[PDB]
Ligand binder design. Structure first.
Ligand SMILES: *C/C=C1/C(=C/c2[nH]c(/C=C3[NH+]=C(/C=C4\NC(=O)C(C=C)=C4C)C(C)=C\3CCC(=O)O)c(CCC(=O)O)c2C)NC(=O)[C@H]1C
Ligand SMILES: *C/C=C1/C(=C/c2[nH]c(/C=C3[NH+]=C(/C=C4\NC(=O)C(C=C)=C4C)C(C)=C\3CCC(=O)O)c(CCC(=O)O)c2C)NC(=O)[C@H]1C
Lengths: 735, 730
């Protein structure tokens, strides 16, 4: 950004053999050390401790009415017997160079003088200038303006009051408020002017009309002027400070000679006199009050002080009015902003929430297209570039520093993307966390706009070796720019980025609970578990739980002759319906081992009807397979068949994983027994153990039984064939 | 926070039957509508459209030089023939009541008068004051003050210039800068005064000395004065505005009579004249330039305007100076800040990064104790109260709103000793992950100007004593520096911004393998494509293990022995499997399933799987030392490995995916393991072929497990050669 770019190193001044200044090298003119002054005042420099005079402007003798011999090598003690002790008191040695001291002198000849002093290291710089010794303006003009500035209701009105007041105070033929853009171009956003004068209002001027080292200088010394655009500069004698054998810094002297480049610009523009006051906001040059007179004009010093004070006042009020205008913009989005904040705040699946048309993330930013990248997938709303180009933008976005990126001409910030101006000329992108792995990208189409320039566009700065001669309206078509993002839209995006980034709190814990307690647990069960962290006895515990295992009989063998995509599709269908059923019965899915399911009832938390719910779950799982086999045989494949075993008993519960990556699981002979029980089933059948049937109760309807001695058990056991469950399930296997 | 709390509703004023004002209700005094003015000026009110004069102060004739009947019911057009068109243009209908217009008048029997006008609703309010023949040589004192304030190096120095300059401009016997705290107590942070006056510098004063409705009014109308603290008010006549039959709002008139309660305070303090100017920063009352004279003093209006100018400049520079003071505090901490900023940004296990003493989160904030809650658990550095108080503090911090909680007296915020000061930041929203800085008690003595806030309602009028009253505060820590608040917010921003990076790795590990290395997770994220979630048939090598008979022996162990043994076993097996790039797929009871080929495949999948199996068997030697140390029997382990085409893809539901494998070659692996005995590794012929000549074998078996159409040869593995050089001990 040209405004946030320090000036180039300056070249040596002319009187040290520096180069001549043209529009090629003019950002390097050392305008702060011209070694000369404007002829309407006089300048002395003096040693800061002794007060010996070291330099005089060539006109100081004639100005201060003393022969040049006495003056040179006189002391300020003798030249200013009253003001010498005072400026020492006000400008103590070692004080900042910015500090200035002002006084009136009753001088022997031609009237009173205005004295302005400042210190630069070991050197005192004294400016002398005619004054009335009588404030022409009176007390009320400034006080009235200050209150009127503060009561202006918005930025535009504040600009009107500023230029209208300054022109009333000074009599200038033209007073402009000139506002710098981030690329250091500027625009006349208010103008008060004498009748019959050409209007510059609404015109943009190239950044080169005020070069970077002038803008830097104007950030530190807030007023400067050219009283007479025809007047020759007056040299300092000697031109170098003899304390240093180096140029005398003159940036803080209002009598500093103006650059010949700018002198010529003002003549071309028809200007006899010029003055500007910096508006500085947050340490940055926000703009200028820029004044012109058609004929030479020396603004009296007291009028200048009024201006300098208005400068300070305007610097604060520009900030106040800009914040109020932004807040008013956001005030009209309040209803919509709250609604978007509430949804984003607690949402655990951002993709389904932020793409809802009822949320209208597109309208919230007046965007033409929105990209949402969350988890691993990105979807879009509205007008976006073809899918190949969206992936190229997200790839370049990942390289951008920060968590917010904003531009109204994406083609310039990212060259390869200049082709995407029909839908992505402007872009506002925010990163949920750092790295752009999750982000939102509002896009805006190219908006062709005409720009009124003051005589020339920025690329015509070097057509001549000097300033241009025309400042009349020059229209240029703007290419590749979108409508700019309002500062309130920038803020809205910052608010929403913060909300989603905060929401990563839950999105990390619930995925961490599922890793420990159940990969397929419901968002309610996880919520239930987060509230009650204790009671779970991670270090180990033995207690009763019911275990259910199922397998698809021979599906692993029939899957060696299907498409790999058919297998995955069939397993996805099956597990989907199975998981819905098991969830409905409060079971914890513990493993999806191939085509087999293990379900726990009682871990992570138990209830008195664990066994009954497991049996009912088993029945409905079998019934659910009939719905599943419609799609499978719909796809052209053979029906699936399923056997289920259920056991109930004491198992060891706890962190059965490792220490660094825990898993709440169960271990013991009663787990293994469930598999042996399931191994006695055929398709459609459910075998349960005697402990399960006993624990489940009289609501379980059995078909018959078998005594079996599975390998792994010392004693024979009776297993029971389930036909159904009664109230309140009323679930029955078909026969 | 009494500063950001609106005033209470005022009570009706006395002349409408309201209650007498005492220290019981003085926050309800309607000080903006006294119906009266101070006697060094005169006041008219007129209709905003016709200019008809509606009220006059009772002294208006003496001031304006015309008896009341010629003034009353006359029109401002006739009375101010030049100023009437001007003040209408400056004060248009609807303008803010803050907006003021001033002019000078020259009248007979009246000298030069200052006329200050402003508009309240449909009413114009005109104030008349003696003023001076204009003779200034220019605003030199202002210009010099302006640059002196701008060059002040810090906030203390800025305050010193302001009071020094105001005293030089005015002659006031005492000039103070009075800075409000968030609780609306105030402190005199700079003072310029007569030598014979008792110093108030450094003293704090109760919030009630400037009540909430004075503070609110002082945020809109930036100057008020009491010219003579013994001068009697002058009634308005009539007292009520006839447009409304309601009181006339005088908040915006400098001549407004001062609250009687405050007049008595000034007298009790020995003050003869008073004036203060608001410092308003970001729309908030930051403080007052507060001035006392021991004798009466009517400041001419032109000199008040210079004070008003300095108030505006000082509102700007207080902002500039406080920021620079904070930036200078943090500049000392820069290298330390960068050091913590780097660590917290890229950490995927913040518990081990932040507890590092070389990171020095305690010293960064100059704290005595630090709590660190991340993921499931919490942990503490330095001096922390016990685990009940930490679990109770962490529970209560979930109560607090926002992401940052800052106090220097935790006993007051939360009733329930190493922690008198607390600074807490929420990583994300809700405090599920947070940092808590704790500071111990710092016995400080507050110097109060006469009395503590407890003694506000001791008598029905103001206090008489304003001498130093030292009060010992208990349960307090050294206050958090504003730079230390900014450092905590920065660190909170960083850790919260690192949640996205922490999120990407747990999402991937949740899909592709729970125990995956933080290194291979980075691999899957820079190359996310080609994984083929829809389905694919690829060769992979599969390794299954079991601890034979441990399921039975565990029925005789205490459950805590069972979990401890499995934790030791799995923890060692995981180390070995990860060293060999295996993907632990399931911890099935005491069994492990490991994939070599998923999610990614190298060309030596089979060899690594065989060598991993050998090392797991060897690693069981170091496990069986800890298991027998605990007094238990030693574990035995059998291993089977198979290599074959399997279906690879999303095997879970569509909603909760899991990258898994399915097929007969997966199931054959468990059958191959079932033939092993303790200490033995059986592998299939396809594994032996893919692994290559570096595998050392003992013998072989032809087996035909059911569910298999054709017999298969399995091979007993003795060890692995270069570069592994592992052999099963024999
Ligand atoms: C290659 C160098 C160039 C150059 C140099 C230059 N310009 C300035 C200072 C100013 N230029 C201003 C420009 C404007 N005045 C207007 O009235 C408008 C629009 C209506 C514009 C854009 C202004 C305002 C200033 C500030 C000075 C002032 O207030 O008069 C300097 C610095 C002068 C100095 O302080 O010594 C220099 C070196 N101007 C170019 O256009 C090219 C040729
Ligand atoms: C129960 C009511 C109380 C009360 C009322 C009250 N106080 C004010 C205004 C001011 N009080 C000030 C206090 C101080 N002056 C000092 O010099 C110091 C410290 C050294 C303090 C704390 C100040 C500065 C003001 C502003 C007025 C001024 O500049 O003199 C009002 C409002 C006055 C008005 O605008 O009419 C009221 C109602 N003060 C209490 O102490 C209790 C009794």
């Amino acid at each position: 950004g040209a405004m946030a770019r320090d000036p180039l190193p300056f070249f040596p001044p002319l009187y040290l053999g520096g180069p001549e200044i043209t529009t090629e090298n003019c950002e390097r003119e050392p305008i702060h050390i011209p070694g000369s002054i404007q002829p309407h005042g006089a300048l002395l420099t003096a040693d800061g401790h002794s007060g010996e005079v070291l330099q005089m402007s060539l006109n100081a003798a004639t100005f201060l009415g003393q022969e040049p011999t006495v003056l040179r090598g006189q002391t300020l003690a003798a030249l200013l017997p009253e003001q010498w002790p005072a400026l020492q008191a006000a400008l103590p040695p070692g004080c900042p160079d910015a500090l200035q001291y002002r006084a009136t002198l009753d001088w022997p000849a031609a009237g009173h003088l205005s004295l302005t002093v400042h210190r630069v290291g070991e050197l005192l710089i004294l400016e002398f200038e005619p004054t009335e010794a009588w404030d022409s303006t009176g007390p009320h003009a400034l006080r009235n303006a200050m209150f009127a500035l503060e009561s202006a209701p918005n930025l535009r009105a504040l600009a009107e009051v500023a230029t209208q007041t300054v022109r009333e105070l000074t009599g200038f033929d033209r007073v402009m408020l000139y506002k710098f853009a981030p690329d250091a171009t500027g625009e006349v956003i208010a103008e008060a002017r004498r009748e019959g004068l050409h209007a510059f209002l609404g015109h943009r001027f190239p950044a080169s009309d005020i070069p970077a080292q002038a803008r830097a200088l104007y950030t530190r010394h807030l007023l400067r002027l050219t009283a007479d655009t025809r007047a020759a500069a007056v040299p300092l004698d000697p031109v170098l400070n003899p304390q240093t054998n180096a140029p005398t810094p003159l940036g803080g002297a209002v009598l500093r000679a103006t650059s010949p480049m700018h002198m010529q610009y003002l003549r071309n523009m028809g200007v006899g006199s010029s003055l500007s006051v910096s508006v500085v906001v947050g340490g940055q040059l926000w703009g200028l009050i820029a004044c012109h007179h058609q004929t030479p004009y020396v603004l009296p010093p007291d009028l200048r002080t009024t201006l300098e004070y208005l400068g300070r006042l305007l610097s604060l009020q520009v900030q106040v009015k800009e914040a109020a205008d932004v807040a008013a913009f956001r005030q009209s989005l309040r209803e919509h902003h709250a609604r978007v904040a509430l949804a984003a705040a607690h949402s655990l699946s951002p993709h389904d929430t932020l793409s809802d048309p009822a949320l209208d993330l597109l309208g919230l930013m007046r965007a033409g297209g929105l990209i949402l990248r969350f988890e691993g997938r990105w979807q879009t709303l509205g007008e976006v570039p073809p899918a190949p180009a969206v992936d190229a933008l997200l790839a370049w976005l990942e390289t951008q520093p920060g968590a917010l990126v904003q531009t109204d001409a994406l083609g310039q910030l990212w060259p390869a993307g200049a082709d995407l101006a029909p839908s992505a000329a402007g872009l506002l992108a925010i990163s949920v966390g750092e790295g752009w792995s999750e982000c939102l990208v509002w896009l805006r189409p190219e908006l062709r706009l005409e720009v009124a320039w003051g005589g020339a566009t920025p690329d015509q700065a070097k057509d001549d070796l000097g300033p241009r001669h025309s400042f009349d309206t020059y229209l240029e078509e703007k290419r590749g720019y979108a409508e700019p993002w309002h500062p309130g839209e920038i803020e809205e995006a910052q608010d929403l980025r913060d909300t989603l980034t905060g929401a990563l709190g839950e999105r990390l814990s619930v995925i961490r609970v599922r890793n420990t307690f159940g990969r397929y647990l419901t968002d309610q069960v996880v919520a239930t578990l987060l509230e009650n962290p204790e009671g779970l006895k991670m270090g180990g515990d033995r207690r009763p739980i019911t275990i259910l295992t199922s397998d698809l009989r021979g599906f692993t063998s029939t899957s060696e002759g299907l498409n790999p995509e058919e297998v995955v599709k069939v397993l996805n269908i099956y597990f989907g319906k199975m998981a819905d059923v098991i969830t409905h019965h409060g079971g914890t899915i513990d493993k999806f081992m191939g085509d087999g399911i293990l379900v726990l009832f009682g871990a992570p938390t138990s209830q008195q009807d664990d066994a009954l719910r497991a049996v009912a779950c088993g029945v409905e799982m079998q019934l659910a397979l009939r719905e599943v086999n419609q799609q499978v045989t719909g796809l052209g494949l053979q029906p699936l068949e399923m056997g289920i075993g259920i056991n109930t008993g004491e198992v060891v519960v706890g962190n059965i994983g490792s220490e660094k990556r825990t898993k709440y699981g169960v271990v013991g002979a009663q787990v293994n027994l469930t598999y042996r029980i399931e191994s006695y089933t055929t398709g459609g059948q459910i075998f349960i153990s005697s402990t399960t049937l006993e624990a489940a109760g009289d609501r379980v309807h059995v078909n018959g039984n078998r005594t079996v001695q599975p390998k792994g058990v010392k004693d024979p056991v009776v297993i029971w064939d389930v036909a159904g469950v009664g109230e309140p399930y009323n679930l029955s296997l078909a026969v």
